[PDB]
Each structure stands twice: as structure tokens, then as C-alpha cells.
Amino acid sequence: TSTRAIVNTARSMVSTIMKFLDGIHNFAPLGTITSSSPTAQPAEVL
């Protein structure tokens, strides 16, 4: 029953294909940082 009721989260050939098509990672540098206060100093340096 449990085998029926779960899907394998282990990576499979779909992940392998994604890798073929090119511990945790900081994604803050890729983002854009804004503030609701119009007078705030730009926070991109953060």
C-alpha cells in the first residue's frame, strides 16, 4: 500500500537529462532586493 501511495523523490533519468543539458547554495546574489519604504537606502550590497 505505501509503495502505491508514494512517488520516488530519488533523482532519475529526467534529472540526468537535465544535467546533460547543463552544501546548499546561496541564491541571494541572483535576486533583486527592494523595500516598501521609499526612502530606504538601496540594499543590493546585502
Binding site: 533523482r11 533519468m13 540526468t16 537529462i17
Partner: protein
């Protein structure tokens, strides 16, 4: 004619030459070689008349003039001899006959053909009846010069044909196209890759005439050759392509072409890598290393702006320099190359000056009068408006021969002067054969234990996602053995081509479907590359799409994809795919073709070994470029 020239009509020695005809690649520069048979038939003063039919000559910022005389030769009545070469038609016909090896039982030596080509090139330059002879023997001239001779002969014939094209006679372009197409079927038997390079350069330029004929010829040859290429793939080559992305044939000793980089040096198998030692340098600059010579670069501690520095390279002997390549260096504004054998101030020659060396790499390809220098001065001028303290300028690569032939060193056969080796080369070739066989055996034994799990289960997918340590070590060993095999294959092909040079100095000759059967795999791959590029340019220059539909239909397209895209090299795969999109992407069966290919190649019952990832990337690209076709 203009009023001045009408007044001086009888005094004309070189007919009016369009200024644009003298242009250089830069677009705003150039040179006219004012010459004619009348100039040769004579012996103190001249007039250069420049008339515009800012406006006209006002756009001519700067002009310069030089005069060059004929070399002083011991031959008696040399002026009468030159009159003789220029006048008599029998002379041109017999030159053509000897070039075509249709005289004296075809025992004309390659050096003899080279001299005949020199004479023909001089004649074509002087003139602009010889054109009639060239057109009548065009097929045979092309055959002998592009499919049975070396890179140098092919380049010289390419120059001769260029001069002929530049010339009330029938247009030479169509006739050259017909000759090239008639010889196309012999491409599998072409002797050297550098020769095929010039052949295809000429064919690509002259294809503008009779586009349909060139298209059908290229398509037929490509279809014929792709089957043979696919039939020659071995399971080991498939394994190397798939597991490692290595597409060379390490177990096939025969190469066909070597390049460095129609934008790269070609035909480098016929020449040797030239080693050199830094002997003198300007200021505290030096060279550092950052068979082929190690990559070397000039380190300059202080570059400044517009500052000249120089490095002197000693090859250790007078070397027949034939090819040079210097990587583009943005740190300098210009690069000058001078060459001298005895001394800089004794026999110094300016080899080249490159002013766009900052935005283009320096490429001297197959110097037709190859210098016989020994010492090489590279003078680099730092970039203007730049004060980068330290500069690292890649010296580049230099090729040629370390064994000058008696005629190559001959100082009387040049413009503006200032058997034991064969035995040794054959011994070296045999040594390299043995070493390369040992390396191939090593690679074979290592690959026979290499296994590629199919991508049909999660465990194999994880194997590919995280390559296990033992797999990593096996791949490292395979890469090392494969690199050894490729280096030894390159050395073996270079040694074979040097041995052929020596046997060609000595009287000797270099050599339909059986042709394709007997061609080497690398020769077939080079032919396929050139044919695919020709077809792509054909479509770009587009009735050529009207033809290529009798061929390259659903079945032909599928066969071509299977033969070239699955097993071909990355470039062959890419170009075949893009050609197929441009040709059949708008066809109704196109989407069915893509789905059928996907089914056949990626269904789990397929045992064919191929680079699934690369073929899938190709399929995605092809489908994206044909997504306007509703059927995809």
C-alpha cells in the same frame, strides 16, 4: 577612353584598372599591380594616370608607388625569352599539357608541376589565348592540382584560377564550376586535406552560377559518403563517443586534415611543427612555456602604450617556414614579423605586418614562396591608450619543414633575394608505427573493460548523475590512453606526410563507388564537413530549394539523419541537423520524421550505442527551429 588617354592612347602600357580591383580585405586600402605584356616588351620613364569617372579621387587619402624589375638572369636574350613566353600559344598549351601530366608519359615531377604553375601564375598576372587553353583543360587541371598533388600545388593552382577569374571571352566562373563538379566525384580519392580545402574554397566562390547543379552534385556525393561513414563506425568508437564525448578514430592510423584556427590554418599534416628557442629579447621581457612545440608566450614586465618590444626566435637551422599562427592579443596594437637566415641586417626580410592583430589572430597559411629563414623577430607594439603593467602575448605556432629541398633553398628561383634524410624519416615512421600500435593496444584493452549502463532505469540515471569513483578512475585512464593514441596518430601522419614529401622530391606520383569504399574514415568526415557547409551556404544564397526535394525527401532525410547525426562528429551532427531543418523543416512529413527518429532512437528496445544527450539536444534544437511547422 578619357581625353588624356585618347591623346596618350599609343603610350598606354597597362589598360585602365579599376581602383576597387586593388582593394584589401580592410575595405579602405589596397594595391594595383600595374603590368602588361607591353610593359614586359620594353626596357626609363612612366606616367601613372589616376582619373575618377568628398568625390572620386578626393576620397584617395594617400598614395604610394614602387617599381619592380625582372630579376637579372644569366639566360641569353632574357628579354627575347620573356617575349617568347608571353607570345606563343603553343607555349601555353604545352605548359597546360605538362601540368596535366598528359605529356612524357605522365612522369612530370611535383616540383616540375610547381614550376609550371609558377609560370602559369606569372602569365595570368601579366595578362590580367591562355584562357582558352585553361578552359579546355580545366577538368584535368583541377583534377591534377586538387586531387593528386599536395597543399602547395593546390594553393598555387587556386591562385592561377583566381587570376583567370579576375580576367570578350566566355565567363570563366561557369566553366570552373563545371570542372569542379565533374571532379567532385573524385573527392574521396583526394591526396591531401589542404588540397580539398582550396578545391572547396573555389567551388564555394563559383557556386553562384548553376546553383542547382552544385546542389545536386553535393547532395549525391553526401548521400553516397554518409552510408559508408556510418558503416565504418565500430562499437568501440561508439563507446568513446557516448561515454567520453571523444569522436576521433584512435584506432584508425590515417588522418586527412589538421587545423588550428574557412577561418583556420588547413593542411597541417603536410608540414612539421617548428620548435624554436628564445635568443634575444628587448628590455627584461622573456618567453615561457605557457611532436608539437609547447605553448609559449612572451611575458613583458612593462608594456606602456605604443611601446615597441621584440623577441628573437632561433629555430636552430634554416627552416622552410610555411605556416604561422599567432593568437589574437588585445594588449598590443600591432605585430610585425621579420625573418632572416644569416643576420637581421644581412638578409633581413619583413614577413608580415598585422595592424588588426588586436581584434584578429595572425594567420599566414601556406606561403606560396615559402621563406627559407632561420631567425624570426616578432616586434609587438603595445595598445595605444593602455598602461597594463604586465603583458602575456601568446607567441603562437609555426609550421614548415626542417629539411629544405635543393630547389626550396635555391636563391635564384625566388623574388628579391638577399636520400639519407628519407631513410631516417622512414625509420622514424616505423618507430612511430610501433609505438602507436602499442598505444592502440593499451586503449583497446582498457576500453574492452569499459561498460556503459543504458539510461533506462533510475539506478543507471544515478550512475550518470554521480559517477562512481572506480568509473572516474577508469575514465581518467581511458582519457590518458586516448590522448597518447591521438598524439601518436598525429606524429605518425606527420611522419608519413614528411616521407611523402621526400619521396615526391624524388621522382614519384601521389597516387566511383570503390573510391568511397577505399577512402579513410577521416577523409570521408572531412568531405562530409565540406559538403554540409557547401549545402548550407547554398540554401543561404537561395531554385536550389526546388531541387533537393527530389532528394532529401522523408526517406532520404531519415537516412541522412541516421547516418550523420547519430554517429557523426559534433560539427557534422549539428550541420546535418540544421541543413535538414532549413531544407525539410517546412514539409508536412517533417513532424512525423522527428517523432519517428525519437521513437527509433530513444525507445527502450533500441540497442544502438550513441550519444543520447547530444542527439537529444540536436533534436530539441531542430524541433525549435521547425516549430512553425504545425506537424512537429
Amino acid at each position: 577612353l578619357c581625353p588624356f588617354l585618347e591623346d596618350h592612347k599609343e603610350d598606354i602600357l597597362c589598360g585602365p584598372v579599376w581602383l576597387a580591383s586593388g582593394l584589401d580585405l580592410s575595405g579602405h586600402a589596397g594595391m594595383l599591380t600595374l603590368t602588361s605584356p607591353k610593359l614586359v616588351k620594353g626596357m626609363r620613364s612612366f606616367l601613372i594616370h589616376v582619373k575618377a569617372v568628398l568625390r572620386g579621387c578626393d576620397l584617395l587619402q594617400e598614395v604610394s608607388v614602387t617599381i619592380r624589375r625582372f630579376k637579372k638572369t644569366s639566360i641569353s636574350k632574357e628579354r627575347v625569352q620573356r617575349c617568347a613566353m608571353l607570345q606563343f600559344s603553343e607555349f601555353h598549351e604545352k605548359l597546360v599539357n605538362t601540368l596535366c601530366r598528359k605529356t612524357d608519359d605522365g612522369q612530370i615531377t611535383e616540383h616540375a608541376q610547381s614550376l609550371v604553375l609558377d609560370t602559369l601564375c606569372w602569365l595570368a598576372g601579366v595578362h590580367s589565348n591562355l584562357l582558352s587553353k585553361t578552359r579546355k583543360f580545366l577538368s584535368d587541371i583541377v583534377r591534377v592540382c586538387f586531387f593528386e598533388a599536395g597543399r602547395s600545388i593546390a594553393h598555387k593552382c587556386a591562385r592561377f584560377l583566381a587570376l583567370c577569374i579576375s580576367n570578350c571571352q566566355p565567363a570563366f566562373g561557369p566553366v570552373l564550376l563545371k570542372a569542379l563538379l565533374d571532379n567532385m566525384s573524385f573527392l574521396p580519392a583526394a591526396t591531401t586535406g589542404g588540397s580539398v580545402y582550396w578545391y572547396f574554397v573555389l567551388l564555394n566562390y563559383v557556386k553562384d552560377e548553376d546553383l542547382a547543379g552544385c546542389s545536386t552534385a553535393c547532395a549525391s556525393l553526401l548521400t553516397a559518403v554518409s552510408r559508408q561513414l556510418q558503416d565504418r563506425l565500430t562499437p568501440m568508437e561508439a563507446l568513446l563517443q557516448t561515454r567520453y564525448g571523444l569522436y576521433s578514430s584512435p584506432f584508425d592510423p590515417v588522418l586527412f586534415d589538421l587545423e588550428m584556427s574557412f577561418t583556420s590554418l588547413t593542411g597541417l599534416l603536410e608540414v612539421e611543427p617548428l620548435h624554436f628557442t628564445c635568443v634575444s629579447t628587448s628590455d627584461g621581457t622573456r618567453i615561457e612555456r605557457d611532436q608539437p612545440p609547447p605553448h609559449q608566450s612572451i611575458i613583458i614586465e612593462r608594456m606602456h602604450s605604443g611601446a615597441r618590444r621584440f623577441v628573437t626566435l632561433d629555430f636552430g637551422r634554416p627552416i622552410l617556414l610555411t605556416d604561422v599562427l599567432i593568437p589574437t592579443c588585445g594588449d598590443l596594437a600591432s605585430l610585425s614579423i621579420d625573418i632572416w637566415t644569416l643576420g637581421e641586417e644581412v638578409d633581413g626580410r619583413r614577413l608580415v605586418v598585422a595592424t588588426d592583430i588586436s581584434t584578429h589572430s595572425l594567420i599566414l597559411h601556406d606561403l606560396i614562396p615559402p621563406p627559407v629563414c632561420r631567425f624570426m623577430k616578432i616586434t609587438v607594439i603595445g595598445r595605444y591608450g593602455s598602461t597594463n603593467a604586465r603583458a602575456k602575448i601568446p607567441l603562437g605556432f609555426y609550421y614548415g619543414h626542417t629539411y629544405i629541398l635543393p630547389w626550396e633553398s635555391e636563391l635564384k628561383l625566388m623574388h628579391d633575394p638577399l636520400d639519407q634524410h628519407l631513410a631516417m624519416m622512414v625509420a622514424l615512421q616505423e618507430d612511430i608505427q610501433c609505438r602507436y600500435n602499442l598505444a592502440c593496444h593499451r586503449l583497446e584493452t582498457l576500453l574492452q573493460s569499459i561498460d556503459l549502463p543504458p539510461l533506462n532505469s533510475a539506478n543507471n540515471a544515478q550512475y550518470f548523475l554521480r559517477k562512481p569513483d572506480k568509473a572516474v578512475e577508469e575514465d581518467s585512464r581511458v582519457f590518458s590512453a586516448y590522448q597518447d593514441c591521438i598524439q601518436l596518430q598525429l606524429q605518425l601522419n606527420l611522419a608519413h606526410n614528411a616521407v611523402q614529401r621526400l619521396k615526391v622530391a624524388l621522382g614519384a606520383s601521389r597516387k566511383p563507388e570503390d573510391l568511397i569504399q577505399t577512402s579513410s574514415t577521416e577523409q570521408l568526415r572531412t568531405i562530409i564537413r565540406y559538403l554540409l557547409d557547401t549545402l548550407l551556404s547554398l540554401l543561404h544564397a537561395s531554385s536550389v530549394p526546388a531541387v533537393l526535394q527530389s532528394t532529401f525527401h522523408a526517406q532520404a532525410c531519415e537516412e541522412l539523419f541516421k547516418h550523420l547525426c547519430i554517429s557523426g562528429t559534433p560539427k557534422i551532427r549539428l550541420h546535418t541537423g540544421l541543413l535538414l531543418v532549413q531544407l525539410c523543416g517546412g514539409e508536412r512529413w517533417w513532424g512525423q520524421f522527428l517523432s519517428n527518429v525519437l521513437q527509433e532512437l530513444y525507445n527502450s528496445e533500441q540497442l544502438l550505442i550513441f550519444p543520447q544527450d547530444r542527439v537529444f539536444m540536436l533534436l530539441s534544437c531542430i524541433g525549435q527551429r521547425s516549430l512553425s511547422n504545425s506537424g512537429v
